């Protein structure tokens, strides 16, 4: 009864806000240069991944648990959500990321705060190289999300939340060495806003993840497992007036 | 057939006593300053999470496997358990934590004993900051618990025990840096009793987790996925006389 | 058609032999003092656990996947298997552990070989203190096994293999500091035969685990979730003549 | 309508190529000597394993998700796939490994490139010893794979993808110390071609993994769980003309 005007839509947008707040808080907080014991690569990798896995499990049934502007955009291109759901989700994700980083800023002691765990290019490498890396990291993540959340799947699914979570961990085990690992425009945007700190190569953390995810969406939803759908039904999905 | 008098209820209370004993024993025992090899952050975090994850799987069918007064009180507020089940569970949890911490004291060598892994603030974290952190830590946990044990769930659940387990691990990966990570007033209370060691900040490890869990319950059960029910049925739940 | 004469029984005894060989090989192999990169506590605990988890998944459907004399004896006392099945399994497990430890001895370089990762009591720990620890370590494991493999379970079980595996990992995260972590008489026995090195505290690695596992069986099968059966039926299980 | 010619087959070959590309990229990428933070044993092992778990979850429904010439050949021997499928999968796997290694070479900084994480025999290990290790490592993996993907299984399977994945992690926790851990001829071939360097022991990374997986297939499909097909049916599978 009008997609945008429903209580379900209000709960979904709020859930996207809340999930991204919690994600960023946990992600950045585990990555700070704590004097007591500097976090290791695997430590940070599992922290980010377990945050997504926990949040996917907890708030996934409310909104779909995107928690990531690149994932949301790819689902739009692959014809899975409406334009307006995409807009509100992305908006909620960026606001959530800012809040999460802001809350972290207010609780972290001064010796730990540092750069608030912003993404940083590895200066032994170039923009183009780093962007290719982020394209790959987000590509495998996206592909795993689409495969784990496809209601058509007949292969035993296991735990979608834990599979998706551990894909985030995988991305970090390589990506940290290149860019601090983004895979998520909101993860990069949040702390950059709170610390008023945008590096020249900030575009990498938007273009890489988005292109990676969208490529996975094209591959998955259009080449590997296409669906039925008339053109008018495809237009209806974009508008949010599709009756299945 | 009169809740408090049933064999089921007796087993439930025993299981909450036993689960907290084993949890606290393993948790604290993994976190001591073993001179042979000092436990790392990730190592401690996984021990706490796998303990909860193993105990959820093993004893959860008996009692619901709360293993945590903050969670028990949250489920009361959310109208899921009776007042008497709450009192007995909390009592069983506190006594169990003391038993586990006591058993550890009796087995651990002198060079490893230390302060028996009591909770303690970072020397640069204030009580106010610690408070907000514990709230967030227990909030994500409670939310993951309620989502993973909801009978109404249609989303593939995966493993609720391991999801809840890894959500605890998630908590520790940030929490240890602030308060040694509590998320659980019984976990804080057990070693504090055995060592007769209550820091001024001890209240944080009670209020922080309880408020965090209660907010998650209010959100989950009254805002996101309400049950409705008549006000006489709600009262019947509190008094232990509700029939489905 | 006669238990010991069935093809299924032969496959089962072989499976227990093979699983224990592979388990002990991976277990000990991961724990050698490799000079290029000394294995960390978490490294070893995960290896042991992932070994059991992988072998439960792969060979459990053939034999039950005990891979542990303590578990087998516990299932005998809990009236789940026959006496003759118990005898052959233990035999196969002990022989398997010698094979695995022997094979590792054959491939490992001497700069890493050391004691072939035999169990050893911590200097600062009495035999009796190690006794209580080994009891508890094996107790939580057995309890998790019985809960995860119970065909009466209505609770989402998730992955019994991974849950059981991670329980082994949990055991090592504390137990390594006390005894190198046994939980398994065959695991202690294997390298001790190959190295011809039996420590004074060797009985601990038998009594601790066996007592811990048996207590868990009594608790689970006779107190928490019993099955009321006639005396003659119980005797029929022991003799291997029972028909459900 | 002729196996090789179908749309499904074309996708399956591509999926194997893409899976091996991504696998090798992440695997080698996680293993480079990054001077800022040298990857730990457990760090590398989880990267490799989680790569397989993620790719098995994502692309397994498309191809069977072999990502490994040893597994593919084992499945041919075990009468599970056609000769033509085995040929194209192996070919696609090897081309994918080169592509993945090639892409890493293009993005990795000079200070971390090193040997591009080619497998390398331990100086203190003989070729014959490394041979036995690789046999055992791939044996346990193949066994886990066949048990987890058997549609005749009644025991709860849990997460096939993650069980297989963590089996790979298990392989590495022992294998890295001997050979850098191969378990997969493509994984060894890829960077060897790109770097134009083949070790004297390179055959071990082929023969070891292939023998181990084939033995596992003979044990699983002909000794433990046979299917009793007629000889004409077996020949039909080999030719890809089998109808169930
Ligand atoms: C690092 C450790 C990773 C541990 C991964 C645990 C894998 C989880 C894992 O193994 O989950 C397996 C799920 C599969 O679902 P199902 O069909 O068995 O249950 C019915 C199902 N449709 C439902 O109702 O949800 O098991 C649920 O209990």
Residue numbers in the entry:
A (entry chain B), B (entry chain D), C (entry chain A), D (entry chain C): 2 to 245
Question: What is written in the article reporting this PDB entry?
Answer:
The flux of water across biological membranes is facilitated by transmembrane protein channels called aquaporins (AQPs). AQP5 is found in tissues such as the lungs, airways and secretory glands and consequently plays a major role in the generation of saliva, tears and pulmonary secretions. There are two consensus PKA sites in AQP5: Ser 156 in cytoplasmic loop D and Thr 259 in the carboxy-terminus; the latter corresponds to Ser 256 in AQP2. Based on the crystal structure of human AQP5 it was hypothesized that phosphorylation of Ser 156 could cause structural changes in loop D that would break its interaction with the carboxy-terminus, thereby flagging the protein for translocation to the plasma membrane.
Since at this resolution, information about side-chain positions and interactions is limited, we truncated AQP5 S156E at Pro 245, the last visible residue in the high-resolution wild-type structure AQP5. In the truncated AQP5 S156E structure, seven water molecules were observed in the water-conducting channel of all monomers with one exception, monomer F, which contained six water molecules. In both structures, a lipid molecule could be observed in the central channel formed between monomers in the tetramer, albeit at slightly different positions. Similarly to wild-type AQP5, this lipid was modelled as phosphatidyl serine. Since there were no significant differences between the strucutres of full-length and truncated AQP5 S156E, we used the higher-resolution truncated AQP5 S156E structure to examine the finer structural details (from hereon denoted as AQP5 S156E). No structural change of loop D was observed in any of the eight monomers when compared to wild-type hAQP5 and the interactions between loop D and the carboxy-terminus were conserved. The carboxy-terminus retained the same conformation as in the wild-type AQP5 structure. Comparison between the 8 monomers of AQP5 S156E shows that the carboxy-terminal helices overlap perfectly, suggesting that the shift in position arises from minor structural differences between monomers in wild-type AQP5. As is apparent from the electron density map in Fig 5D, serine was successfully replaced by glutamate at position 156.
